[model samples]
Target: EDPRRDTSLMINERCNFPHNMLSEENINFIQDAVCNGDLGAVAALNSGLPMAPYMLEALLAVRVKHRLTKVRQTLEPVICYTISVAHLINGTRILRSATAKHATAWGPNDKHRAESGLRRIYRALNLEDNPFDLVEAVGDLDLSQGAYEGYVRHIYSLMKSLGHDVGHLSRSLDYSTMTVFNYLYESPLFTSQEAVTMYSRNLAGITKMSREPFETLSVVHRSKEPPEILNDMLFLLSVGRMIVLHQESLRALRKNLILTASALCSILYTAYTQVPETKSLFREVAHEAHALLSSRSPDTPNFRPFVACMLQFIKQIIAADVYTCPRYLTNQILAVTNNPYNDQNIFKCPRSLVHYVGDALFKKTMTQELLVSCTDQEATYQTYELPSVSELVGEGVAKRAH
Candidate 1:
């Protein structure tokens, strides 16, 4: 009775691979590896597999096959429980392959599967990082002599094992020695707040170590489509924007504020100029910049100048670099930088720059006035020497229209 039955956002549709890609022997090996939840062996197949794409499709194919089998044998309460577990394992596989072996792109529909599956496995009904929802889903199932009691324990163990893997990764990410972490570009799903905080700082950090490598990070990112690259760049830029919110509080980074903000602005400008569709994100960033400018203007001169200078850099980056960063697609962005005046030797600066803290080469609003002597002598003038008033006034609107 579900109205959206035909619009099922199943992963199997996009997970398809050519029949020739997986040979009988490869299929036999993969079928057993994925079916019994043998993630290690499943991971090892990546080496022998044709390519990561082929490997990914083939792996998810096994899960789909398992999905069909589980659904056929199990119904109702058991069906939902088994289906959720199967989804968790498959998603974990996809997530690992995405980072470890190959970088994968999810189609629009496939994104729902990955996004929902990750949340279900880690977040579920409650926001806590536990599998209590598994129990909740199957709570009222009719059980004979404790038939599936071990199921809960087994799934919990799997979830914890995933966490343990995350810890192992955490232990390895000592940025002091590591030049680059390739896996960061691979996976989209972040596992921990620690990881989020770690990556966020690493993305916006101004230290020589953080700055040198990721400075031109967007230019070097590998992706098939522009939007994919845009999405990644935007996420990094947003975190950079988030860091700006606490511009006053980041005591260590405060001194080097310009350098830090410049790095983020550079990335933002790069994306905004290069990709047409991606320019919309900066409207929000600009909104925050205005609020930041207003809030911090009356405080320390240091912070206001930092935000002001950063805004100037952003404006110049947009205005100065017309080749890549053209006129902003959004009018809001245009309003932030556009001046609406038409006069010679008179100009008005845009809001972000005009409506700023200090009084450097700027004004709150520009004013101009004009005065002229009257030609009342025409009353006594004769027609012989008289000139038309239109002559002195020059042309009318019709002539100026040319």
Candidate 2:
């Protein structure tokens, strides 16, 4: 049997995973918790909050019935924290890492809201002192944005420090295994989604049962906002609009800020050019969104217009983003021709030299043959049996031979 074909653990285990991405102590903590199904540890892991954007998508794969039933009695509290941490981890990582590339200064209002939100969690949870705090923070957490971001950043640093990929660093441990273990679980209060859900359910139930004058003390929605892909896509589309504005604002910077800004803008600037396929795709999405809104006209008045705008911007971005890649490759080739070593070289370019005499039939031919080609599913998650990480990445074959 093809183990890779049947198993999920294969890819889940490896595929550029950030395992040893953590410190010696933390790695041990994660390995122990996941391997032993330590609920308390999972909870603690959840508390710190994870900022990995794709985290919920990853864990949601675990069906609610089995995952809920797996909750260890000792780890109930940990579970609550884990949930909080996941949101934080996913959102936080995006803010911390992504903002730098297209860094937008946050508004004063944004800063205030963010600060207040952070303070609320810290005070409500009493994070500094707790029993779970005694253990490390790792797999025990169901999820957390803050913890995951910190952990991801740490992993990145470790890779540079040790000259190894996160996966290798984690699997082939340096120092003691216990050192890795402690790093992960020592902090405890790691968080998870289940823990957060339980928190919301308990709070909502308690609030409903109370006889006192109604007050909204706090709230976390049990039903998630929506399919994040849609929300994210909308947000990304909005940012795309911002990018269009940014190009103009950048022109100002080029005039006054620095000469470098001019060069950077030259490299980064997006031209408003659209290809036939790109125009076609956006027109299609816009048509669909409008058709949807027209049918549900009574429900979403505000949304239809916004979707209409999204239709326009999608093309704008495609013109800006898609065209640049091909041009970038062209520039690289031209830049190579200018290299110091090539200054004295007289390597005749066939196309350019041939163009001078302009032969009647000399032209490059591009084939678009109407020929049938074979095709099949190139990769799939799994069909049966959990795949081991080794099978996932095929890295272990080298280790096995040695």
Candidate 3:
């Protein structure tokens, strides 16, 4: 099980619709359109529509429904496969809506043009442009098999398609784009092993006290509650006091990252789904959180979603905005700026993880140092795929009671 599962994350409450706002007819139409590849629905939703949340919720719901059906008929694999295929087909239809109707958010009146351009690029790269093209059309490989992979890639495309530089987006066939393509750029799982390693804990004591494979999780995220909510105090006091990893590298920390996005969606998306009356609540909280992080650093962002916009806005408003454009372009720019790398922009470009190549730099010179100092012990890491840290840190206890 994914380590984050211990958090009991669910997308239900996040996907609710208001009373009589979205009629059952509307829901069925949407479900069918999304499942059957209705380009017209995609077009109608191109600009003002909440495509990401809508499609994701539908697909996720369908997936859960199919999975539940399979579980109910556990004795039969064929029934399980058929039920699963139904969900997969629906997911594919919804995702295809992105390019089907033709809108890029790409450039002015360039919706159709941009869509065509993307097709050309895909042909050049020999990649299948159709999201469903990646999956087997038959009931055999249907299910999350293709939808999950398509989601990661589709989001990446949506981001790039909105980039200012059409050429840059066109040529961005590198690791940055590839990360979110094909499958989740990184694993969403956060096992106890990963928690100890990534958090840099000396885990000998915990292991000695319990078993090697016991599940452990830090505090529940302050932003939102998952399925079986864990207490903040309990999480922090009991499990959070362990790790002392370098704060700088924490940006790249894979543990709990997947849960972060999906879980966050639960709160914001659910608000959109359940309480259309509370539309501002979704905007307010998402904006506030975005403000908090954006203020922490500076970086050129292609953030479009309201949540994204707030982050870039806050980061720029909070930190010193670094201008990367040519100085001659405009006199309003006082100086050519430098880069401050932070999670704000780093997530948009996951490749930055490798070289730490970024557009902005965190202003605090000892930011990580000061943060790491607050921890209980010296920082450490786990050795995975490669090999190293685990064998040693395993010798020492990871947490020290405060």
Candidate 4:
């Protein structure tokens, strides 16, 4: 038999692929590459196929099930090259296909083996783990404002149930944020508060779980001395001013009283725009909170300067938070405040830290990128829809079994 024809037949028959999965030319090149030990050629051909996304799942299964080195090396680039295409062209269809593959049984421990494969592919996409299941479950639902809010709560409820097991809980957490972010971004009502809610909405559930694993998975700073508490306090104040200023309407709706009352009703100043007065007010608040928390601890004489700089730093956080960018707020806090001990001189020092602000916190960023990914063009979503669990599992199993 002609080796070309023989290898072509081997792929078509043994692999059991659908017609047009690859162009005739690609099939020829891929066959020659595989037969001749030409991975570079195989990789090149694999980079741009209509079927690349679906093939990613198959290759992952091949690598894990058989522990094939070639499949993995070839697959890494295959995924890196074609992942964006899955986003651009088949956002929902490829998601559905990937979901069905995992939900279907391959054999004993079948679902586990498939899940292992799918996870690797999703990681390559820089997404939360196990996206397919969530996307699959409610992917077809019209995520209108009311519908999405309920969906967000549904995802949160599911996470609460899984919160005791750290691994599943973390995945559930990541999946919740990613799925909610994606679904909400796709909605017409994508606003800052919604964006903030998408990220921070699941906070209490994670906090209620195990301490060690949760910290291991989180942006840890110190024991009870995390910058998170301080930054969140600042965030609360930032949004409060937004409410008092009659700024962004939606954020003020869920706006906590600490910020609103402090901005409008506090003795320090009646408004945040009063900069000198604002600094004095923050100084007083920081001092009071510090003294209240640590009566025995000696006050650093120059701490007011540090508090002053933090007010400015938090002003930036407030701007982002008002637009629904708390995740960005978290990222900024992590940058300056990751380890309180290491960062004592960084953000808490007596010197007026002037240099790091423009470079670290003041650069341009926002919700457009937050909402839509590189692959999310308008038409990308026009064709694909997510599948239900039963449709993906039961019907999928029957269809793929033969």
Q: Write the per-residue lDDT of candidate 2 for residues 1-402, one digit (tens) a residue.
A: 422111111222321122222234432323333424443333333322221223322342211122233222212222222233332332233223222322222233432333344344335545443322211222123224455445435424423343435444334333231112112111112122333232222222221221221111112221211221111212222222323333333233222222222222222211111122233333443444445334544542222222233324332442332323324322333344332112111111122222221232112121112223443844333222222221211221222234
Candidate 4, pairs of clashing residues: 192-323, 192-324, 240-259
Per-residue lDDT tens digits for candidate 1, residues 91-202, read 3333333222111222333333333443554543345654333322222223322333343333334444444343443344434311122112222223233334434334
Over all chains combined, what TM-score does candidate 4 have? Answer: 0.18
Error of 4 at 212 (Å): 38
The TM-score values for the models, in the order shown, are 0.18, 0.16, 0.15, 0.18
**lDDT of candidate 4 over 136-214, digit per residue (tens):** 3232322244544454453344323433232342332223332221221212111123333422332211111112111
Q: Candidate 3: worst 10 consecutive residues by lDDT? A: 361-370
Which model, 3 or 4, shows the larger lDDT? 4
Error of 4 at 368 (Å): 32
TM for candidate 1 is 0.18
Clashes of 1: 0
> Compared with the true structure, what per-residue lDDT tens digits does model 3 show for residues 349-391?
2122222212121111110111223346665543322122122
Query: Each model's C-alpha lDDT?
Result: 0.30, 0.27, 0.26, 0.28
Top candidate on lDDT is 1
Q: What is the lDDT of residue 113 in candidate 2?
A: 36
Error of 4 at 232 (Å): 32
Where does model 4 exceed 4 Å of error?
1-18, 21-26, 33-139, 144-150, 154-402
lDDT of 2: 0.27
Cα error, candidate 1, residue 393 (Å): 64
